[PDB]
Design a protein around this ligand. Structure first.
Ligand SMILES: O=S1(=O)CCN2C=CC=C(c3ccc(Oc4ccccc4)cc3)C2=N1
Ligand SMILES: N[C@@H](CCC(=O)O)C(=O)O
Ligand SMILES: N[C@@H](CCC(=O)O)C(=O)O
Ligand SMILES: [Zn+2]
Ligand SMILES: [Zn+2]
Lengths: 260, 260
């Protein structure tokens, strides 16, 4: 019937530009876990689609004053895209305005350090001042810290919100670059999936420390009232049960390992 | 306003009879993770409820001949209960007939051995014959093997379906007892949640070995068209985000664990 507009985000190893992308067109420009997942979901649900990178480069949050959503969430809410296929965290505030499939991947918030940084846990970060730490802007990790009542995480947020210079970053790449360049004086709070990927990539100078802070999932999101909602949900379950999601995780994490 | 009928299952530590249950009435007869969760779901959704134990003691499968659903799934499908609050696995075949909330707990199929059994993986089990292995006789783990399109799990199914005497058990308790009494000659395939619980119980003679074979979740289930669906889903998200689900897992698994 109609070509489905898929909103997604450039985030390794979910969606990446191929090495030779400038000689390619349309969906062929991109590779990654979510590029493969989009192809599979489309096949099972019987639609044609166009991958479009989210304009503002954000996941999505609601401005507290204007109540306007940005990011991939806003693209669905305001009718700019038909579906989001991305590492988009299922959250309460989002589920109030968009629908999510059952989760296709598990994750938790985690800590990234430069190798040798004397930090082993969230408690460790909160007890010192020499090592700065932050999160991604406009995402679910930031919101976790803003909202937490757990003593350690409340203390961390109190520090983060007013720290100078700013500890928050615009992209994961910016957070990772900051860790790598700061000689051990910056630690980054990010999802375990992204942390684990980066740990197995050159220059192999980062690591995940401590347990995950929470347990949650990424889901495929559709605007409320979407005719795709049921089919997409069942397709996610079908792909998990046929072992394809596990295969894709091995393809884009384990097989892409550069650190041994 | 009507009292909501909750179907659940006697499975430790999700729902158990209190030691003084004969002297107690209604919901007060029961304790466990799902008893605590039901109380919270009901409070956040604004309903009164009655806990009922599934008549046939089963989770839910569709008979190949009659096409009749049994267990908790059957109780929802046939209108005998309004909601299931239990360790009920989200699956494609079930999602076609009932609705699940987002998961409240993560799990995968796992291997329970008697300590010192020379088994480390599902691969190991599939390559040998001295050590028998089986599953719960009417649940999602059995169906995982039966419907698998994965060669290694098809091999395991081909063995299990034809093993004599039967490798299948009626309850988790029966599976655990079989492991404990078989001197390392029976391994039990069960969900990681139950495996982890038993590992922390006297006489501390079992353990979980290897990685999980899959990744999925338990969900709170409602019959299609239920007016409870949205509120239940948002309640699960709220309770995960506020840290309650983690607290309840700690309470019932580890806090009073019997194996140090
Ligand atoms: O709905 S499923 O059965 C659909 C397929 N499946 C696949 C991969 C991963 C999951 C998962 C992700 C996140 C998840 O989140 C949690 C964790 C712990 C407490 C509450 C929520 C729980 C299961 C998953 N679930
Ligand atoms: N997956 C997150 C983005 C990453 C993060 O916040 O750490 C989201 O959906 O907002
Ligand atoms: N949680 C399973 C029961 C246990 C199992 O099959 O291992 C179900 O919902 O069917
Ligand atoms: Zn497929
Ligand atoms: Zn299909």
């Amino acid at each position: 019937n109609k070509t489905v507009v898929v909103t997604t985000i450039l985030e390794s190893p979910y969606v990446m530009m191929k090495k030779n992308h400038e000689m390619l067109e349309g969906n062929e420009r991109y590779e990654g876990y979510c590029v493969d997942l989009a192809a599979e979901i489309a096949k099972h649900c019987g639609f044609k689609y166009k991958l479009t990178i989210v304009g503002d480069g954000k996941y999505g949050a609601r401005d507290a004053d204007t109540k306007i959503w940005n990011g991939m969430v806003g693209e669905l809410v305001y009718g700019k895209a038909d579906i989001a296929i991305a590492p988009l965290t299922i959250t309460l505030v989002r589920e109030e305005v968009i629908d999510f499939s059952k989760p296709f991947m598990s994750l938790g918030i985690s800590i990234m350090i430069k190798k040798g940084t004397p930090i082993e846990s969230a408690e460790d970060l909160s007890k010192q001042t020499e090592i700065a730490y932050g999160t991604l802007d406009s995402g679910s990790t930031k919101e976790f810290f803003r909202r937490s009542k757990i003593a350690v995480f409340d203390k961390m947020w109190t520090y983060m919100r007013s720290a100078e210079p700013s500890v928050f970053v615009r992209t994961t790449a910016e957070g990772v670059a900051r860790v790598r360049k700061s000689k051990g004086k910056y630690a980054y709070l990010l999802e375990s999936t992204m942390n684990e990927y980066i740990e197995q990539r050159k220059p192999c100078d980062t690591m995940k420390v401590g347990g995950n802070l929470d347990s949650k999932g990424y889901g495929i999101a559709t605007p409320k009232g979407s005719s795709l909602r049921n089919a997409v949900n069942l397709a996610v379950l079908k792909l998990n049960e046929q072992g394809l999601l596990d295969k894709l995780k091995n393809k884009w994490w384990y097989d892409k390992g550069e650190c041994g």
